[PDB]
Amino acid sequence: TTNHDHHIYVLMGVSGSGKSAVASEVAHQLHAAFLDGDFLHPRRNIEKMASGEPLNDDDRKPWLQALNDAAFAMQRTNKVSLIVCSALKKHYRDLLREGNPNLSFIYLKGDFDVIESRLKARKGHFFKTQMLVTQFETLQEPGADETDVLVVDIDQPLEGVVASTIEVIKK
Amino acid sequence: TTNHDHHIYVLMGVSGSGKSAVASEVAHQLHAAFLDGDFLHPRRNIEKMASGEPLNDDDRKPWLQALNDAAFAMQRTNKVSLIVCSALKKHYRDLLREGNPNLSFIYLKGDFDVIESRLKARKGHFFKTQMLVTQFETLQEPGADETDVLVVDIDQPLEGVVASTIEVIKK
Numbered sequence: 001t002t003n004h005d006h007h008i009y010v011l012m013g014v015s016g017s018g019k020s021a022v023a024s025e026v027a028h029q030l031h032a033a034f035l036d037g038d039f040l041h042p043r044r045n046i047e048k049m050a051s052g053e054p055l056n057d058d059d060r061k062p063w064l065q066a067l068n069d070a071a072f073a074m075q076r077t078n079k080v081s082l083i084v085c086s087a088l089k090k091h092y093r094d095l096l097r098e099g100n101p102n103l104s105f106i107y108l109k110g111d112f113d114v115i116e117s118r119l120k121a122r123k124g125h126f127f128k129t130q131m132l133v134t135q136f137e138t139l140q141e142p143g144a145d146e147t148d149v150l151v152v153d154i155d156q157p158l159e160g161v162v163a164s165t166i167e168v169i170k171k
Numbered sequence: 172t173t174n175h176d177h178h179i180y181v182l183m184g185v186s187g188s189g190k191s192a193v194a195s196e197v198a199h200q201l202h203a204a205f206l207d208g209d210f211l212h213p214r215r216n217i218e219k220m221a222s223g224e225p226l227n228d229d230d231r232k233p234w235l236q237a238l239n240d241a242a243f244a245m246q247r248t249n250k251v252s253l254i255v256c257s258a259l260k261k262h263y264r265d266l267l268r269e270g271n272p273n274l275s276f277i278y279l280k281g282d283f284d285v286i287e288s289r290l291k292a293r294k295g296h297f298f299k300t301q302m303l304v305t306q307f308e309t310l311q312e313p314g315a316d317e318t319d320v321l322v323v324d325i326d327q328p329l330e331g332v333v334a335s336t337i338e339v340i341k342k
C-alpha cells in the first residue's frame with residue numbers, strides 16, 4: 001500500500017517560522033496536496049485548547065497518529081503532499097515517520113530575533129514573548145542523524161523561502 | 172466552543188463536477204482554510220480501496236465522523252472553512268451537520284452530459300461510463316428541505332464557477 005513513488009513533505013519549525021504562509025504558496029505552485037495539521041485534533045483536544053489550556057504530549061498522541069494516517073491517504077493519489085506540523089520534538093517526528101518511509105521533513109529554520117520580528121509585524125496582533133520562548137525551548141532541532149530532514153533559511157523574503165522550499169522539494 | 176461567526180462550506184457533488192479544482196482557487200483567493208476530505212479516510216479504508224474493494228456505507232461512518240470532527244477544528248480559528256467531500260447521500264450530509272450548526276454545503280450541480288465531457292477532457296485518462304452513472308445513481312440531490320445547501324451551476328467555465336462559488340459564499 002505504500003507508493004514509494006510519491007512523497008510527503010512536512011513543514012516544521014516553531015510558531016512564526018513560516019509553515020502555513022509558505023506551504024500554501026508551494027502547494028499552489030507545484031499544484032499539490034496540502035493539509036494543515038492543526039485540523040486533525042480530536043474533539044477532546046479542541047475543547048481543551050478552547051478552555052484556554054495547553055494540550056500535553058498524551059493529547060498529541062492521537063493527533064499525530066491521525067496525521068500519520070492522513071499522510072498515508074494523501075500519497076495514494078498525489079506525488080507531492082505537504083502537511084504543516086511544527087513537530088518540535090523528535091518523538092512527534094517518529095510518530096509521523098512510522099509506516100511512512102516516503103515521508104520527510106522540511107525545516108524552516110531561523111533564530112529568535114528573526115521570528116520575533118515576524119510576529120510583531122502581525123497587524124493588530126499583540127505580541128507576547130513567553131509564547132515564543134516556549135517554542136524555542138521545546139524545539140529539539142533535528143540533528144544530522146535525522147537524515148530525512150531537509151532545511152530552509154527563512155531569513156529571506158517569503159518568496160525566497162518559497163523558492164528554496166521548492167528546490168529542496170525538486171532536489 | 173462552536174464559533175457561530177465562522178462558517179464551514181462543504182463542496183459537494185459528483186466525482187467530475189470540479190470539487191477540488193474549484194475549492195483550491197476559492198481557498199487561494201479568499202485566503203481561507205481548505206481541507207480535502209479524501210485525506211481523512213481511516214488506514215483501513217485506504218487498504219480496502221487499494222485491494223480494489225469499494226467502500227460501503229459502514230466504512231464511511233468513521234470517516235465522516237472524522238470529517239465532522241475536522242469541521243469542528245477548522246472553524247475555531249477561521250471564518251470560512253471549505254471541505255471537499257462529495258456528500259452524495261442525505262445521510263452523509265446529516266452526519267457532517269451533527270455538532271456543526273455552523274456548516275453548509277455548496278452543490279457543484281451539473282447534469283450527466285456536462286460532467287462526462289469534462290472527465291474525458293484530460294489526456295491519457297481512460298473514462299469509464301458506469302463509474303459516473305453510479306455516481307448519479309448514488310447522488311441524492313439536496314432537496315428544498317435541506318436549507319443550508321447552496322448550489323452553483325457548473326455549466327459555466329472554471330472561472331465563473333469559482334466566481335459563483337465565491338458569490339454563494341459571500342451572498
Ligand SMILES: Nc1ncnc2c1ncn2[C@@H]1O[C@H](COP(=O)(O)OP(=O)(O)CP(=O)(O)O)[C@@H](O)[C@H]1O
Nearest residue numbers: 014015016017018019020021022118156157158161
Ligand atoms: N519569509 C517571510 N518573510 C516575511 N514574512 C513572512 C515570511 N514567512 C512568513 N511570514 C509572515 O510571518 C508570520 C508567520 O506566519 P505563518 O502563519 O506562515 O507562520 P506559522 O504557520 O508557522 C505560525 P502558526 O503556527 O501560528 O500558523 C505571518 O505574519 C506571515 O505572513
Ligand SMILES: Nc1ncnc2c1ncn2[C@@H]1O[C@H](COP(=O)(O)OP(=O)(O)CP(=O)(O)O)[C@@H](O)[C@H]1O
Nearest residue numbers: 185186187188189190191192193289327328329332
Ligand atoms: N468549470 C469547469 N470547467 C472546466 N473544467 C473543469 C471545471 N471544473 C472542473 N474542471 C476540470 O474537470 C475535471 C474534474 O476536476 P476535479 O478534481 O475538481 O473533479 P472532482 O474534484 O469532482 C474529481 P473527484 O471527485 O474524483 O475527486 C478536472 O479536469 C478539472 O481540471
Ligand SMILES: [Mg+2]
Nearest residue numbers: 019020021084
Ligand atoms: Mg500554521
Ligand SMILES: [Mg+2]
Nearest residue numbers: 190191192255
Ligand atoms: Mg477531488
